[PDB]
Write a protein that binds this ligand. Sequence first.
Ligand SMILES: [Mg+2]
Ligand SMILES: [Mg+2]
Ligand SMILES: [Mg+2]
Ligand SMILES: [Mg+2]
Ligand SMILES: [Mg+2]
Ligand SMILES: [Mg+2]
Ligand SMILES: [Mg+2]
Ligand SMILES: [Mg+2]
Ligand SMILES: [Mg+2]
Ligand SMILES: [Mg+2]
Ligand SMILES: [Mg+2]
Ligand SMILES: [Mg+2]
Ligand SMILES: [Mg+2]
Ligand SMILES: [Mg+2]
Ligand SMILES: [Mg+2]
Ligand SMILES: [Mg+2]
Ligand SMILES: [Mg+2]
Ligand SMILES: [Mg+2]
Ligand SMILES: [Mg+2]
Ligand SMILES: [Mg+2]
Ligand SMILES: [Mg+2]
Ligand SMILES: [Mg+2]
Ligand SMILES: [Mg+2]
Ligand SMILES: [Mg+2]
Ligand SMILES: [Mg+2]
Ligand SMILES: [Mg+2]
Ligand SMILES: [Mg+2]
Ligand SMILES: [Mg+2]
Ligand SMILES: [Mg+2]
Ligand SMILES: [Mg+2]
Ligand SMILES: [Mg+2]
Ligand SMILES: [Mg+2]
Ligand SMILES: [Mg+2]
Ligand SMILES: [Mg+2]
Ligand SMILES: [Mg+2]
Ligand SMILES: [Mg+2]
Ligand SMILES: [Mg+2]
Ligand SMILES: [Mg+2]
Ligand SMILES: [Mg+2]
Ligand SMILES: [Mg+2]
Ligand SMILES: [Mg+2]
Ligand SMILES: [Mg+2]
Ligand SMILES: [Mg+2]
Ligand SMILES: [Mg+2]
Ligand SMILES: [Mg+2]
Ligand SMILES: [Mg+2]
Ligand SMILES: [Mg+2]
Ligand SMILES: [Zn+2]
Lengths: 205, 56, 159, 104
Amino acid sequence: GRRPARCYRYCKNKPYPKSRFCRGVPDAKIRIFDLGRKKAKVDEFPLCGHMVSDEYEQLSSEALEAARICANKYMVKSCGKDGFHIRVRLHPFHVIRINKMLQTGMRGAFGKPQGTVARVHIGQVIMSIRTKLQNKEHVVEALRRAKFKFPGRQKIHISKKWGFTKFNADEFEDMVAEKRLIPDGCGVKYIPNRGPLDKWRALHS
Amino acid sequence: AKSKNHTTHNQSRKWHRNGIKKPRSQRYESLKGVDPKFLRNMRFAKKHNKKGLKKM
Amino acid sequence: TNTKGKRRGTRYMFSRPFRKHGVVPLATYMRIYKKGDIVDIKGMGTVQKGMPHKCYHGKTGRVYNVTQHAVGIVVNKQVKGKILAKRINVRIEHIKHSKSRDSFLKRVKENDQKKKEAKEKGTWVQLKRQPAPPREAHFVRTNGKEPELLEPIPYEFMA
Amino acid sequence: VNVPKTRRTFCKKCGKHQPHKVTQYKKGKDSLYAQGKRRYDRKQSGYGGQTKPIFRKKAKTTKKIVLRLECVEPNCRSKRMLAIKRCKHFELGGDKKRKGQVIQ
RNA sequence: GUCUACGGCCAUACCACCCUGAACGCGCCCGAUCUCGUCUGAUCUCGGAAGCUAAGCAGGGUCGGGCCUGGUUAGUACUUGGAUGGGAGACCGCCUGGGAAUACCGGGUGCUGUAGGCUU
RNA sequence: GUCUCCGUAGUGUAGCGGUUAUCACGUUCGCCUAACACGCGAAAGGUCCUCGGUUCGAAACCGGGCGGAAACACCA
RNA sequence: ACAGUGCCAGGUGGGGAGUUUGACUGGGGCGGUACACCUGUCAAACGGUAACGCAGGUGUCCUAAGGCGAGCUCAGGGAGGACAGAAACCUCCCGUGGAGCAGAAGGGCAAAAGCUCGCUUGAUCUUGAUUUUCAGUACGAAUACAGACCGUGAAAGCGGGGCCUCACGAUCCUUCUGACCUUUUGGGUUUUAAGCAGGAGGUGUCAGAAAAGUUACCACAGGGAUAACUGGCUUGUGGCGGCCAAGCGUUCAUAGCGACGUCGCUUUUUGAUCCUUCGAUGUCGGCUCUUCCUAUCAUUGUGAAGCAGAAUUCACCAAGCG
RNA sequence: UUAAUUAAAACAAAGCAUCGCGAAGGCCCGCGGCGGGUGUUGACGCGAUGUGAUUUCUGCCCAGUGCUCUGAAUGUCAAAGUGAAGAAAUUCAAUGAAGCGCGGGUAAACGGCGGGAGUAACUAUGACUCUCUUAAGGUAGCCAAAUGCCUCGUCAUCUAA
RNA sequence: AGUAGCUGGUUCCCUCCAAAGUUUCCCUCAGGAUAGCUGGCGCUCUCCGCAGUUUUAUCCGGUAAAGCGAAUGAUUAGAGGUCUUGGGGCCGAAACGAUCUCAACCUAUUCUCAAACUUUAAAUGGGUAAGAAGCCCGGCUCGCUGGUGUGGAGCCGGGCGUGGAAUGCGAGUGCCUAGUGGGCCACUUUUGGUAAGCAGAACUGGCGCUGCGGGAUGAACCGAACGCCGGGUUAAGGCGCC
Ligand SMILES: [Mg+2]
Ligand SMILES: [Mg+2]
Ligand SMILES: [Mg+2]
Ligand SMILES: [Mg+2]
Ligand SMILES: [Mg+2]
Ligand SMILES: [Mg+2]
Ligand SMILES: [Mg+2]
Ligand SMILES: [Mg+2]
Ligand SMILES: [Mg+2]
Ligand SMILES: [Mg+2]
Ligand SMILES: [Mg+2]
Ligand SMILES: [Mg+2]
Ligand SMILES: [Mg+2]
Ligand SMILES: [Mg+2]
Ligand SMILES: [Mg+2]
Ligand SMILES: [Mg+2]
Ligand SMILES: [Mg+2]
Ligand SMILES: [Mg+2]
Ligand SMILES: [Mg+2]
Ligand SMILES: [Mg+2]
Ligand SMILES: [Mg+2]
Ligand SMILES: [Mg+2]
Ligand SMILES: [Mg+2]
Ligand SMILES: [Mg+2]
Ligand SMILES: [Mg+2]
Ligand SMILES: [Mg+2]
Ligand SMILES: [Mg+2]
Ligand SMILES: [Mg+2]
Ligand SMILES: [Mg+2]
Ligand SMILES: [Mg+2]
Ligand SMILES: [Mg+2]
Ligand SMILES: [Mg+2]
Ligand SMILES: [Mg+2]
Ligand SMILES: [Mg+2]
Ligand SMILES: [Mg+2]
Ligand SMILES: [Mg+2]
Ligand SMILES: [Mg+2]
Ligand SMILES: [Mg+2]
Ligand SMILES: [Mg+2]
Ligand SMILES: [Mg+2]
Ligand SMILES: [Mg+2]
Ligand SMILES: [Mg+2]
Ligand SMILES: [Mg+2]
Ligand SMILES: [Mg+2]
Ligand SMILES: [Mg+2]
Ligand SMILES: [Mg+2]
Ligand SMILES: [Mg+2]
Ligand SMILES: [Zn+2]
């Protein structure tokens, strides 16, 4: 049906989003980017491991969907359906075209949309998994398997941030004690020393 | 048969063989294009310059 | 190919800057332009009259004519291997006095005054500019402190 | 396109603005003794067939409307041609537009 | 210290709320004969001077939003010129110069021209 | 594939920018006949294929979708 | 007094004559118009910049939708008010424009460029200069002025079309307008005719021939600038092969298979392109004959099976011989 | 019958059927005429076509395109001629030959000869019904035929295949 | 001796200079006209002017990057309010009474994006200026503008040379003019295409027109460009033997 992914591995064309100038793009293969216990509070899952791209390339929505299933199944098998929270961090927005042959030749050769791909950079995170700390080895194995669904080189890297937050894990707890961080579900809100003093009263009352 | 369409390749090489000379500058410039009303008077100012020759 | 339209490609060139739309400040019309002035042309989209053609945006010329609303400018335009002196008519909204000659005019006056002040004193002063010379020898005091030793930091995969 | 049947414009004879009667201009019939029609008849006479081009590839679907102004001053009665842009429908002294009305 | 008329730059001047306003002002305010205009003297126009800073307006406030300006981001991203540099590539490193922008942190919150007032 | 064209009650079909969306058949009710049929008097029933746009107003006009029917595909 | 003939006039007249039967173009034809224009992008922060590149528009519309002045402020929303509801009209409040400005888009615009009134014809007459495409030619469109006549406003001013970027047309001919105009041939008068200036009638292949086919009966000058074989690059498609392992295999991922994904190889498929060959490389298939490859069907020697035997299946060295 | 790549199913043929013409004619030649051929002819003839022995048959369509027939009843219609205005050139009007338009005939003239839906008591069919539709809507025959893409149609026979 | 925008050919030597395959118009696409590129003839001066360069000032810009807790557009996930609307229920005599619950809604957050988005915003780049045609004085003319002998322009006399950044270099100017108007390749940027020794662009440099050392071999790669020679030394590349 679709061409081998080697035909579209390289970011050769400018980004080609689904817009009012590109109509008729088929729906993407990946429609779910979060699964696991999305509703876990920020503190239940202090660990976060990433799959990081070593290559500047295009990933197809089929490979994102395949990896999501691959990583999720191994996590459910080893940590339970409520022991983790996965977040695919790439959305397939760039559209790839196909000039379908069977004849005009190369005349009028601009192609119709064929699918979608995500344009990833060196160092960009492909997907992330947060779970409890005694699942460090399970996270590494879950992401190591998912790599086989992608072209090119990736690295699994355990983050020093707390879960899916932007704050270093070693200093997360104290910031929560000083009310600089207020849990808001999956993440945290950051409280600066600014704005109406009334807010400070509510936090400190 | 099809052929090439357009190119400026090799053009700046041709332009610089005899140099891209700037326009020639003289200390007096033509009064062509200046306002007719202003120029009508300027002619009248030159016409009667001889009147005040003796005072000068 | 491209259209030969007059205002093609000026989507950003002729638009007004951010949060600077609306009324045109009246000091734009209180400027006095004289024959022989140097002016910078900058098309303004708010006024659609007397708009200089896009090829003249960002070029500087000499004022040769002044009318009720616009001036005549002699501005060089390069077309292939030649440079032409083009006489355009531009409404005074789209121009502004050039500051290029000021640093020269400021220098002309200070030179003539120095040339006159030093003359009566029977001395000699520098009038010509000069490119920055290589910095002369100097001592650097350590102030009884040892320069901080620096080392390259280890690579750490901040992903 | 609707134009009034009168307008106050410049008359060249009177050298001042004057009322004018506005009418549409019509080409008059071709004289048989215009030098070019005389030359055409002599060239078309005899053998050889057609001797001039006959235009076929018509492309324009409208004409420029020419208004035949006429000074109303009894003494002057000077006339002028005045061309407006192309239009598919042209009327003189049509009903003037009304605003804020129910369209039946 | 500060206001009025006309301004220049056009948020450091805006927006929200709160406090305070001496004198002169500027207003709110009271009327419709006249001028003028309305369904309506509400607005516009006109004639006034009983009352009031309630509001506008002015000054001040807010761990205020915005705006302005610095720091950090960062010699990072990007980039001019160079190599018979690496790599299957994708790309990457170095040499020679230039060098950003968020989030985050701090500070500031109209200046001023002409003419005329008030303010021992 | 290019190009042309078409979707309107249950069926086949009209609609000359403002229709109570036309016609026939069909369905429903009442008459007639012992009864049916014909025949006479009445009635209901349109997602105007779908989205969006111009318009005072669109089933119509204008683009994009969902189906459908045509004519072309030659020189080797 | 007609047949008839001579000469004119109208019809008919592929029986016959001459001639034409666009261009671009991933060969040509079919298809499209990238042929004259305009917007955004491409386009690599001056300008310029190509493809049958991408997304669109144009051949019109307007007596006001032109000009001036005044007064107002829009989309949307919140809260209220008989009939009144999601939606009628009235009121208050917020409202940077999220509306509108003929149309495509982009820019521009808030006591306005928008909406509503009032008065109007600067959409008039006229000589030059300039800008844009550019060869610094024409057209078209546009920009500052200058001379008149007007409109409007209290006035400063604004206006010689549409807020800006598009909305269009030479020579020859014809037609209309202008002057107490020139000429109309030996002189004069008068008709006519020709001139001079300015509009219009149109060339859309849009710097502007007047134009249908077929050729397999065909012709000539050429072209490898250009198609139909081979060969060459490419490998989408075709063919063949790995990697991961959800599952299948009663159990058991991998004896044998293998989804979702992904990495290759090859040129025994078809494409794409047009580099060689058009002063010619004989164009399918079969017959014959030799050789070569392995991606192994058989046979030799082996490993593994969900290999008891027999039969079969997977794999290895392997193209000697069939 | 294509001399010198095609001998044939192609041409011819008898048979059949249309068409023009009674001589000042039909058809044709010729620059030209009291010119010429048919024609030393006369409708059982000459001239122009199509089909192609015999046998059986030759359906429907005159809307299209052709051919043909009637014509001042009557739109357009050249030259000439008639009249009026004017100094005249010129202008205008009236009048109106064929031919076109108007109306008939004609297909052994060129040619043409539909679509959709429902329906019989198992299912399939659908004699039957409704509808839209054109100038007729392909009749009698015949067929994967030298004519049928799909297609190496389906059944049977012929073969071991 | 028909015409041929088409094919083929076009005859001695040396010396000097030396292209174009691009712009616009053309029933123009195998061809012309046109500008550009070339050559020739000079001439006007010189022993101030100029520049494919920097420096110093001064403007222009909307690409790279970045942003989306900023406008437009696209897009993931939780959280807090919620009656201002709906879906499920659920006690009911039943109501906006109660009870929840999931949606939408709003509020701060959060993941991910743009050739036809943007508040920001480079590098490289594009104008201009860097004096005697300047600077400063006194006066005269005007029909232009005007409260003003104002304003602006022009003209006349006069005084000022430390020639007002670096570097390099002699400049200017006029006629006549051929061939060309099929290009192709490489770094970088870049459009279409799966890609192509594919089609199409920008910049510069090349091949074409060009030999020579090296890359065994080769239009373009690397080095370096050429009168006929001797000596020396190199480049890129090399030094088992060839
Ligand atoms: Mg591409
Ligand atoms: Mg060319
Ligand atoms: Mg004749
Ligand atoms: Mg007081
Ligand atoms: Mg009152
Ligand atoms: Mg108070
Ligand atoms: Mg603050
Ligand atoms: Mg202040
Ligand atoms: Mg004929
Ligand atoms: Mg002929
Ligand atoms: Mg052609
Ligand atoms: Mg550029
Ligand atoms: Mg107004
Ligand atoms: Mg004027
Ligand atoms: Mg207007
Ligand atoms: Mg005489
Ligand atoms: Mg043929
Ligand atoms: Mg034939
Ligand atoms: Mg081939
Ligand atoms: Mg394959
Ligand atoms: Mg199983
Ligand atoms: Mg070739
Ligand atoms: Mg050969
Ligand atoms: Mg041979
Ligand atoms: Mg041979
Ligand atoms: Mg083997
Ligand atoms: Mg023969
Ligand atoms: Mg017949
Ligand atoms: Mg008939
Ligand atoms: Mg036929
Ligand atoms: Mg038939
Ligand atoms: Mg039958
Ligand atoms: Mg000859
Ligand atoms: Mg030719
Ligand atoms: Mg032509
Ligand atoms: Mg040739
Ligand atoms: Mg741009
Ligand atoms: Mg970017
Ligand atoms: Mg050539
Ligand atoms: Mg190329
Ligand atoms: Mg090529
Ligand atoms: Mg050559
Ligand atoms: Mg050379
Ligand atoms: Mg060389
Ligand atoms: Mg080699
Ligand atoms: Mg030597
Ligand atoms: Mg060697
Ligand atoms: Zn008059």
